[PDB]
Design a protein around this ligand. Structure first.
Ligand SMILES: COC(=O)c1cccc2cnccc12
Lengths: 19, 339
């Protein structure tokens, strides 16, 4: 499932800004 | 005589903002007015502090001047403080004091004890559509306000949206906010939330905030963002592709709103057409939204965060504590003269 793929991904924590 | 119009309301907001924009407050407290309690989040960090004279709790953002210079964020930091001290809206966090010392810049804001939307959203998985709509409506009104002042916000995400004791949103982190008429060019934001025209280095305008609202609504209602991957470059490839997939549980109204906010052609994007924000406010997905009642904060919120008293931080994660060191020599004084 898409949800399972998100939860296993590396970007489920707080996301830093970029600049 | 006649009741006030939206145009008259926004004109009043602009006059109020411009007075503070043109004559910013400076140096309105100092560090030893406060007791340091705990780090709430992390060029610096935000700390829960207690004001000695009043006993009020505040959130104090501390920025290391040398790290700001090294990260090339000087002008962005000057933007942040100049804008935050001039705005006034029910869903924008209030700056109470600002000051600087030899080492740091300080922005002391109202303490919003309910924690980040991010925390609640990840824990519960996803919000119901009525719940997501309640939060989205506050962002729609907030961007209507900000954009009328020629401000672009540029960092919408659940991490920056704090929940107050009434269950309403407080927007924090104006680090990329900028007052601009026409277009600007800085590659900044958070990868998941960048509009295609930012990625493509085209020049862009306030329509990037409406794209970001589409990302936020999608993430609130799905529990994951519309474009995700393990590396930002793969996120960017998905964003510019023009393709979005929707959960089967999304209503038809939600999908229609999102196809118009997550519209890669900024000239066709809701919020950026001739009717402006009213194309969003009048959309079917918002048909149950009483915009005046949201603005007046008289709508019952989907939930109220747990609160154990003043100074309670149970709705925030724990962070490693580090001492606040102030050098005996002034750093970067010239750069931050107007702060
Ligand atoms: C990481 O930032 C925060 O946690 C934060 C930032 C700005 C204002 C606030 C107000 N009450 C709680 C937290 C905050």
């Amino acid at each position: 499932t898409t949800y399972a793929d998100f939860i296993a991904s590396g970007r489920t924590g707080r996301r830093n800004a970029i600049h | 005589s006649e009741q006030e119009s939206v145009k008259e309301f926004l004109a009043k907001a602009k006059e109020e903002f411009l007075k503070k924009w043109e004559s910013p407050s400076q140096n309105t407290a100092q560090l030893d007015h406060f007791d340091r309690i705990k780090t709430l989040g992390t060029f610096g960090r935000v700390m829960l502090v207690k004001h000695k004279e009043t006993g009020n709790h505040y959130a104090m953002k501390i920025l290391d001047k040398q790290k700001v210079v090294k990260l090339k964020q000087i002008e962005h930091t000057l933007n942040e403080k100049r804008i935050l001290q001039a705005v006034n809206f029910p869903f924008l966090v209030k700056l109470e004091f600002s000051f600087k010392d030899n080492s740091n810049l300080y922005m002391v804001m109202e303490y919003v004890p309910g924690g980040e939307m991010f925390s609640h959203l990840r824990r519960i998985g996803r919000f119901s559509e009525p719940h997501a709509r309640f939060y989205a409506a506050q962002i729609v009104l907030t961007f209507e306000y900000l954009h009328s002042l020629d401000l672009i916000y540029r960092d919408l995400k659940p991490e920056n949206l704090l929940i107050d004791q009434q269950g309403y949103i407080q927007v924090t982190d104006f680090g990329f906010a900028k007052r601009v008429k026409g277009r600007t060019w800085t590659l900044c934001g958070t990868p998941e939330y960048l509009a295609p025209e930012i990625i493509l280095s085209k020049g862009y305008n306030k329509a990037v905030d409406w794209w970001a609202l589409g990302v936020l609504i999608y993430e609130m209602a799905a529990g994951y963002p519309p474009f995700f991957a393990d590396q930002p470059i793969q996120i960017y490839e998905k964003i510019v592709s023009g393709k979005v997939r929707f959960p089967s549980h999304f209503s038809s109204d939600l999908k229609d709103l999102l196809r118009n906010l997550l519209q890669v052609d900024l000239t066709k994007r809701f919020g950026n057409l001739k009717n402006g924000v009213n194309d969003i406010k009048n959309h079917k997905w918002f048909a149950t939204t009483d915009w005046i009642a949201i603005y007046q904060r008289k709508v019952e919120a989907p939930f109220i965060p747990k609160f154990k008293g003043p100074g309670d931080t149970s709705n925030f994660d724990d962070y490693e504590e580090e001492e606040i060191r102030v050098s005996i020599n002034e750093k970067c004084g010239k750069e931050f003269t107007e702060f």
